[PDB]
Design a protein around this ligand. Sequence first.
Ligand SMILES: Cc1cc2nc3c(=O)[nH]c(=O)nc-3n(C[C@H](O)[C@H](O)[C@H](O)COP(=O)(O)O)c2cc1C
Ligand code: SF4
Ligand code: SF4
Ligand code: SF4
Ligand code: SF4
Ligand code: FES
Ligand code: FES
Ligand SMILES: [Zn+2]
Lengths: 426, 23, 263, 78, 106, 210, 83, 27, 87
Amino acid sequence: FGSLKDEDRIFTNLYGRHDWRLKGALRRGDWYKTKEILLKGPDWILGEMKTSGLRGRGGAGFPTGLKWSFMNKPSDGRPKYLVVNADEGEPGTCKDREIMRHDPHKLVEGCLVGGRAMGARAAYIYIRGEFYNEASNLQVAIREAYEAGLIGKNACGSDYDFDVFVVRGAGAYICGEETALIESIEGKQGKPRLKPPFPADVGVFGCPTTVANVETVAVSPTICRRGGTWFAGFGRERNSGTKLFNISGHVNHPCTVEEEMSVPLKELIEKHAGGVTGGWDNLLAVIPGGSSTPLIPKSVCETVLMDFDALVQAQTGLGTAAVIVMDRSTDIVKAIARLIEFYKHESCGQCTPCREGVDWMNKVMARFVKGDARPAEIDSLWEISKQIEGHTICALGDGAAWPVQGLIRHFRPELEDRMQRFAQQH
Amino acid sequence: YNTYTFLDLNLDLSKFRLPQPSS
Amino acid sequence: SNLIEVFVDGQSVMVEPGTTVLQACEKVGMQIPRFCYHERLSVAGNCRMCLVEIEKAPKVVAACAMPVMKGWNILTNSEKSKKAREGVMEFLLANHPLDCPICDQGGECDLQDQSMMFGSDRSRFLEGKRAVEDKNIGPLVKTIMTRCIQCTRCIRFASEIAGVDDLGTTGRGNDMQVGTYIEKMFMSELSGNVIDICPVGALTSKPYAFTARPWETRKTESIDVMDAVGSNIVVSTRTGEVMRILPRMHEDINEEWISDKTR
Amino acid sequence: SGVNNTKKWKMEFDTRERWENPLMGWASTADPLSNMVLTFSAKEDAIAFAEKNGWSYDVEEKKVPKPKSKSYGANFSW
Amino acid sequence: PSGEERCIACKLCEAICPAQAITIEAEPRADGSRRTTRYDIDMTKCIYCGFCQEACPVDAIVEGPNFEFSTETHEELLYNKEKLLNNGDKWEAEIAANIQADYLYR
Amino acid sequence: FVHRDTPENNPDTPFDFTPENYKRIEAIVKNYPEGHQAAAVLPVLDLAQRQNGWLPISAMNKVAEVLQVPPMRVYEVATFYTMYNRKPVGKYHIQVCTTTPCMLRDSDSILETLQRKLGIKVGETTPDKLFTLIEVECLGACVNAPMVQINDNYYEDLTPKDIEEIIDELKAGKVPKPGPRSGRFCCEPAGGLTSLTEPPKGPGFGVQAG
Amino acid sequence: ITHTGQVYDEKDYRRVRFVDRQKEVNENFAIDLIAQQPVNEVEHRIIACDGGGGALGHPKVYINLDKETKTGTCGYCGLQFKQ
Amino acid sequence: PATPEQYVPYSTTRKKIHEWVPPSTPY
Amino acid sequence: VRPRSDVTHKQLSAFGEYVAEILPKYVQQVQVSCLDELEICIHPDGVIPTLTFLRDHTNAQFKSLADLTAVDVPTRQNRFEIVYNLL
Ligand SMILES: Cc1cc2nc3c(=O)[nH]c(=O)nc-3n(C[C@H](O)[C@H](O)[C@H](O)COP(=O)(O)O)c2cc1C
Ligand code: SF4
Ligand code: SF4
Ligand code: SF4
Ligand code: SF4
Ligand code: FES
Ligand code: FES
Ligand SMILES: [Zn+2]
């Protein structure tokens, strides 16, 4: 439900206030049962996540255990690998920036705890190129850990071998995709591959590979070291566990709090963070999972709590759980319009739907903000939107269509008036 | 921080890294 | 017998494991409308003009890259796989420059046909088109590349048949331009094949620029005498003088390709 | 890349003189059977017609592409 | 108006001309542009059906309002590109009025 | 996306990794599996950018050589990513985040202030070559929606006057306290932490026999 | 000689045709008339060229006057546009 | 708001072929 | 879209079965096309029997011969396909 206890908050060093470095980490006791866990077995680790029923902490939601289970199949003579994507291009995902800037070890032991679960030879962490600062913090942390012998061959005084590496991103949101990151590592252009060859079977350097949101890798060790069931209790049904929530825009105290999942949307701005700037009635709309997910208008805001099942009932996605809030002084139409501008400046262009479709919606959306376009065009953008939604090679085209669909779904009268406003002044 | 510090950390963690497989 | 059984709108053909959904339709005899998929070029999935709907399945799959599985019935003429083509063709055409009476791949266009058979009667693109900058790739290939549908056939051929990796994609977004970042001519034998392999008339032949138009050309099938491989070729003659020589497929000798000399 | 024009067997005749009309420069001809391309549906039915009419034939066997195995992942190996 | 021939040698007007009357062999004109070196009607084969004026995407070939052009010989009816272009350099004051008069209905 | 050779930006310019740089080069490679030096492109191309911001056609060709890859490969990587600059950026490259999250926090409000202070249009270098302003997209620090990235400095919660203090510190002197401004630090509920003030529970706590 | 050559060689017997007659030859060569036209200066990177008309001109194509190095020329009008 | 000017046709075609001109001086 | 009435398809289909039952010896295939027209294909020997039954039968009087034409499909062994349209 809500009011996650500090005693249950995984990322204790959030907000810093501790030594993100190892000695702070030791007081955190992050490396407490690592040898034991690995000793227990890879099968024991996946039993822990299956019991946890953790969902993907990245924009896509899938059982974390089943995804890791897939490349637990016997090696075919190719080294298995771990890829941690610290890229978070999605607006409002400062969620991950926290775990690199702070509590970097949380992720380092997440990597080896996760590594033996998939039997990965090594893990590469792709941080956003922008986070040069963040990249500096982690390898200082990674360097500490090996010096200790926590990672490396015979890591944590155990038979198992692991090596952790950090890879420089280069300002691309699409590099965040499950497969495209792999291609970026491989050194080719960051263009996603098709799903038929699933990442596990075909991978980074053509070997089995798996990709996890940094939050997903980070919570593993604590979910196993601590009781996974313990975590499970926090979640709701399929939904489970605490996921960091970032609230940004039109709220009195924008902040990232790792409060519990399944939180009433009205409650998290009202109780933690900062109540919606201007009052809870000054809420034109809420973007729950970030730019990719459709915004939900106030009417439904207070009604649904934050969890992926509840949101999909609501037609929106928990995604990165980045809450972007809009007051009534905003231009709903120009707000979403810049997100389509966010996607035309960013989609790879590999696939026909997304390439022309996202540019086509950008042109129509800019006219919509001006009000130059006629009212009949508004549903035509509906139809352009679903052509892009099911036909794209990756999910970004999936993502571009949803905000457009949300604007037409709940704010169709406002766009018509902008239509009307321009027609009147001629 | 400086432009070359991130890569110098890599320069440093080379040894830390064990050997890499060859195809 | 590792044949696996898969249904093409019911014909229930049996195919080797690992054949693509597009390939399954071919043996029944159906043709998936396709761009960016060439038989002897790697599957890329760029156009996604081949989206089909396997049965009782949530979304449309790319017939060029999806390995057909056991007992999936492909529905190639469903109400969905036509909205998956009526809506893609909307996009390819949206940024396309209307100079079909300039494009000498007038009747030799795999993009007007598929528009004219599987696409849409009208246009909804009431916005502004894009334009790219014509560059010089040589004295044999006229790249009026504002025509390009970014299908990456050229990039692959240049890299998988001719080993000359000079061509490449540059830029992202709608701005992706398929060409040679610095202006270095595409000098190699096997060069002219790009013309034949680009379904769009973006880059076409410069000597045969505007001498003819394909419906008129009478096509006589003959043999290559310039080189001793004896590549099969089709000599296209109009009113009694040869207008162009383009390759005709011989599995064993020239499988759809001919030399720069003999063209 | 359309394969709908390579499915029915045609019986075309030899190519004789195509010359130039002195006055306007058009292409002229004296081969009455020049624009003739009968279309059959099988080798058997074309040989029959030619033999029926007393023409000499030069049958050319069909050349269907053989099956070439294509896989998306293959280009990702190293 | 500038003075540039409108015909860009499409061959969209002999592929429809049912009387099979037109031969428009073309080249790049050495400006890099695209124009005819050859154009033709045999006016003793044409049927005045106007399938060439409605197919032309540029309004180059039209079918003017002349009908006093009888000839004492057969050769004066095989029009060339220069008996059609200076012909069109004659009636353009009289053609354009009728195009502008019927463009909407077409 | 076309490199028309220019005297300044051309193959003529000689690029070569400093003895120190070349060292760095190798470090990167080994990170990747053997015989996969190809992957080194992005990281290496980055060090060519570290060496020189311009990174001219000559520099890319050099990278291809070092990693043995086909030049076009490197050219494609450089063009795809915005991080690499194929033109000479200014000494201080100021990037203002203008995605919707920041906009709603008047990120644009920052823009107008910076254009006036730099006294220049958005997108080009100052005549002084001192600063270069560009309207970049989301930077991943949405919590502090007002935000500008100055050569990694990554400042935040910036207000016209805040940027004012910052731009003046760059113009005279260096290292202008890069980071947030209001003192909200990184993602602190401004009013109060509201969480984690109970000190950490320490190691062993909660193990619950896993 | 027509704008496209065609001039008969003195020996050509194909010259009788014009005896007691003459040769229909247009004096207004479009190679030159189009050169006697001002390069259309523009502000935008790309420009349209409906052929100076909507439905009375040529199909509408957008030309990329992006390089001053080259004045885009609509393939239909032969009009050079000066960025 | 008998005549000598009779249209005569051409072959406006640029002759579409080129014969070897024999060598000017003998060998 | 066509305004094809379905009454006709059925009524005529039914006549096609009637003619096929009344003349089993000469009719090789009867089919009502989707253009709502009927076609009774008869062995060449049935040309006078089949047409006499249609000209002089109370339940099928087909007094006028609209036309007689012969499509020539060269492939078919029996190339010419004489077709008689009756009203
Ligand atoms: C355009 C695009 C951008 C993405 N960016 C990110 C990202 O920055 N971080 C991330 O964790 N996942 C991102 N994803 C989702 C990944 O494809 C993948 O599903 C996810 O990283 C898996 O993490 P999880 O399984 O631990 O949730 C992106 C997906 C798309 C289509
Ligand atoms: S390619 Fe040439 S022909 Fe095919 S559509 Fe585009 S323009 Fe018309
Ligand atoms: S050029 Fe022809 S082939 Fe190369 S991409 Fe553009 S269209 Fe596809
Ligand atoms: S006349 Fe009109 S149609 Fe005939 S070629 Fe010239 S342009 Fe194409
Ligand atoms: S009018 Fe004369 S020329 Fe124009 S189409 Fe009909 S017949 Fe051919
Ligand atoms: S043809 Fe199937 S992906 Fe383009
Ligand atoms: S939008 Fe500027 S911080 Fe993400
Ligand atoms: Zn024009």
